[PDB]
């Protein structure tokens, strides 16, 4: 048996990080060419996410076909071995998961015009291999990368972030322990703007905190967005070098 | 459960010479049916096979027929649902060679096999393998009774957990099921099941002749 705190007077957290550090970010494009039109493998901390974009293609049922826009579908597979303690049941039908899937759809319905691929279907399959806090933000980044890899038109990037709050000051990018310890805010940010695609608060949060917490998240998300551009451009430079 | 009546969910369940009987065409709900009862020693098995078809599938462009087999637990809840699906997949791998599929284009044949009972006696100081040849016997009878064209009579036998199905008078094999048991029983099991096949075959042919008469 043990006990632990949140934020020490020395400005140190349970894992050793300070109040404003992003975890290790690794990004990966075109990971499954023979399985999808677009694919991305995300590593944000201990989080490991495979994202597959299949489409635009013919619908399997003509009943479900829109002549004005493409049909966008997202299925999140949170594996039974994503956490330390293996879950006995499947999480697929869980109301918490249905809300997550619904949330993500609502977010990107306004971010892709989805008016230039009529009579087609875009299927997005996601596999969460490992989970360690901020899984929603990582899900957002995985879809954005995979969609771009598929050459599917969109207006801008959508970057996802996780916020942790203790006392006066929130902690950027929370892990499971911190998530357990304190309420968190998940932010969907469009491009380099201040506009949120997704605002998600599931636990109690003082009303004074949010304005400042939002400010920290937006600044951090911009850094994340910059990294993503670097991640793809860098890969392109590396790929070109490999070709040479 | 809002579909059935499962009762109180806070409760708990209870915690504690080959002979054949063949009957076909006793169900007016389907196109063909069969009853198979076998008693050996202290172990006996009674199962019912129901066949529905061939019925046309709308929009189907298949140039041949489509067989679907499902095993059910009639009374005793013993066999796992996962294992029932496995045997079903094994059974369909057999009759897809037996059934003349070229005769039923744009059509499908559904096969329901109800395992109403099996009785097992074990002494104290696989399992479903023994039922497999009886399932094949039942289906082959139910299909032949229904009017479905069969290239040959499908039959099988169980020897030390090794099940192997034969057609064309034991000259060829339409299915092979081996679980556990012992090694080097290849030649022996093939000869013992071939005798069970020929025995099950003649009784199956006689069955149709009797009821048909």
């Amino acid at each position: 048996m043990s006990r632990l705190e949140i934020y020490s007077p020395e400005g140190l957290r349970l894992d050793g990080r300070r109040w404003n550090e992003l975890r290790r970010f690794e990004s990966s494009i075109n990971t499954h060419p023979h399985a999808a039109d677009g694919s991305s493998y995300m590593e944000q901390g201990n989080n490991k996410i495979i994202t597959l974009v299949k489409g635009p293609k013919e619908p399997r049922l003509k009943s479900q076909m829109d002549t004005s826009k493409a049909l966008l579908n997202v299925s999140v597979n949170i594996t039974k071995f994503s956490k330390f303690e293996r879950s006995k049941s499947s999480h697929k039908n869980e109301r918490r998961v249905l809300e997550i899937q619904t949330s993500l759809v609502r977010m990107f319905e306004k971010n892709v015009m989805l008016n230039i691929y009529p009579r087609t279907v875009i299927d997005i399959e996601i596999h969460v291999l490992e989970q360690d806090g901020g899984i929603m933000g990582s899900l957002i980044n995985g879809i954005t990368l995979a969609l771009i890899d598929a050459g599917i038109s969109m207006f801008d990037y959508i970057s996802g972030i996780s916020v942790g709050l203790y006392d006066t000051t929130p902690l950027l990018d929370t892990n499971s322990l911190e998530e357990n310890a304190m309420s968190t805010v998940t932010l969907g940010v469009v491009g380099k703007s201040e506009k949120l695609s997704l605002l998600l608060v599931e636990d109690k949060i003082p009303l004074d905190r949010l304005e400042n917490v939002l400010a920290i998240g937006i600044a951090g998300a911009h850094r994340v967005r910059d990294l993503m551009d670097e991640e793809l451009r860098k890969h392109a430079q590396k790929r070109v070098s490999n070709a040479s | 459960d809002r579909r059935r009546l499962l009762g109180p969910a806070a409760a708990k369940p209870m915690a504690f010479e080959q002979e054949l009987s063949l009957h076909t065409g006793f169900i007016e709900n389907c196109n063909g049916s069969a009853l198979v009862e076998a008693r050996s020693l202290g172990h006996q098995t009674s199962l019912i096979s129901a066949v529905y078809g061939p019925r046309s599938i709308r929009g189907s462009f298949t140039s041949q027929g489509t067989i679907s087999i499902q095993l059910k637990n009639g009374l005793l809840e013993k066999y796992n649902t996962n294992e029932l699906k496995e045997v079903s997949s094994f059974l369909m791998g057999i009759f897809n060679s037996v059934v003349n599929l070229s005769r039923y284009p744009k059509s499908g044949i559904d096969i329901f096999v109800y395992l109403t009972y099996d009785k097992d006696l074990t002494n104290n100081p696989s399992q479903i393998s023994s039922l497999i040849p009886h399932c094949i016997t039942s289906i082959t009878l139910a299909l032949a009774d229904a009017g479905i064209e069969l290239v040959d009579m499908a039959g099988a036998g169980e020897a030390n957990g090794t099940v192997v199905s034969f057609i064309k008078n034991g000259e060829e094999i339409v299915g092979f099921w081996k679980d556990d048991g012992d090694d080097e029983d290849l030649l022996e099991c093939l000869d013992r099941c071939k005798e069970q096949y020929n025995r099950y075959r003649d009784l199956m042919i006689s069955c149709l002749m009797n009821q048909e008469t």
């Binding site: 594996t79 360690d132 | 996962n82 699906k85 791998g93 092979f176």
Partner: protein
């Protein structure tokens, strides 16, 4: 899975059913296609593997452990099979699940002694399979991944005494230290029957025209159960002569150690 015209299938049959059998690719009746295997990438789990085929087929296996009372928990090794975008219930899923659990039974093809901790407690092993993509019967693909995963699995080490009958100490494990899971995972080979020829590692197009197929397990340098004949397709399934069955078992019996040798590299 693959859709082919009547003309293409007949040509494939001619190519493969020929007495000097030729793969459309050009392989020999015992040659496997190149695969890639990654291991130990899931730190959250006790063991993990990822296998990639040449046709893009991909499978991910995870190994997790749990202390259980072996007096009440009969099965000490549970295999779970899944596919994203695919319903769990499907005939193929449950069949492979049932099959794999028999392949890796506690007292059949696995040394369950290495899972025992004390008189009363043992390690339950959860083998979770995730098939991302597959174009044929993935039974052999999964088997290779499970093998690789179980050969790179590390379990916690016990500290307390191993006699719960008398002293009855609560199972405690020393921090940091772990013991590698020494075990002999079985392999599952799948064969294709085209006419009178038998092919190892059937391709997608090959399986479509095959007359039948075989699923043969392999453990401790010998053929073992489960052994299952299987219809790779459902339009061209035919009965086979017994000598073919004996040919298949013989074929695996001589080419399996070569596969294991290429697979046993740490």
């Amino acid at each position: 899975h693959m859709s082919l015209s009547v003309a293409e299938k007949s040509y494939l049959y001619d190519s493969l059913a020929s007495t000097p059998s030729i793969r459309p690719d050009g392989r020999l009746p015992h040659q496997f296609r190149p695969i890639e295997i990654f291991t130990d990438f899931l730190p959250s789990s006790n063991g993990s593997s990822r296998i990639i085929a040449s046709d893009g087929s991909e499978c991910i296996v995870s190994i997790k452990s749990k202390v259980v009372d072996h007096h009440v928990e009969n099965e000490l090794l549970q295999v779970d099979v899944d596919i994203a975008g695919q319903r769990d219930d499907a005939l193929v899923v449950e069949t492979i699940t049932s099959l794999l659990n028999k392949v890796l039974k506690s007292g059949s093809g696995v040394d369950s002694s290495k899972l025992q901790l004390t008189k009363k407690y043992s390690f339950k092993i959860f083998v979770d399979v995730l098939v991302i993509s597959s174009h044929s019967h993935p039974i052999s693909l999964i088997s290779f991944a499970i093998y690789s995963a179980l050969n790179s699995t590390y379990l916690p080490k016990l500290i307390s005494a191993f006699d719960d009958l008398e002293v009855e100490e609560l199972p405690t494990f020393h921090d940091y230290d772990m013991v590698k899971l020494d075990i002999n995972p079985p392999l599952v080979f799948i064969l294709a029957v085209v006419g009178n020829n038998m092919l190892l590692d059937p391709a997608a197009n090959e399986s479509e025209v095959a007359n039948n197929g075989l699923i043969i397990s392999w453990s401790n340098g010998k053929i073992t159960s489960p052994i299952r004949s299987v219809a790779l397709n459902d339009s061209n399934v035919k009965s086979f002569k017994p000598h073919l069955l004996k040919q298949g078992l013989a074929m695996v019996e001589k080419y399996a150690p070569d596969v294991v040798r290429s697979l046993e590299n740490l």
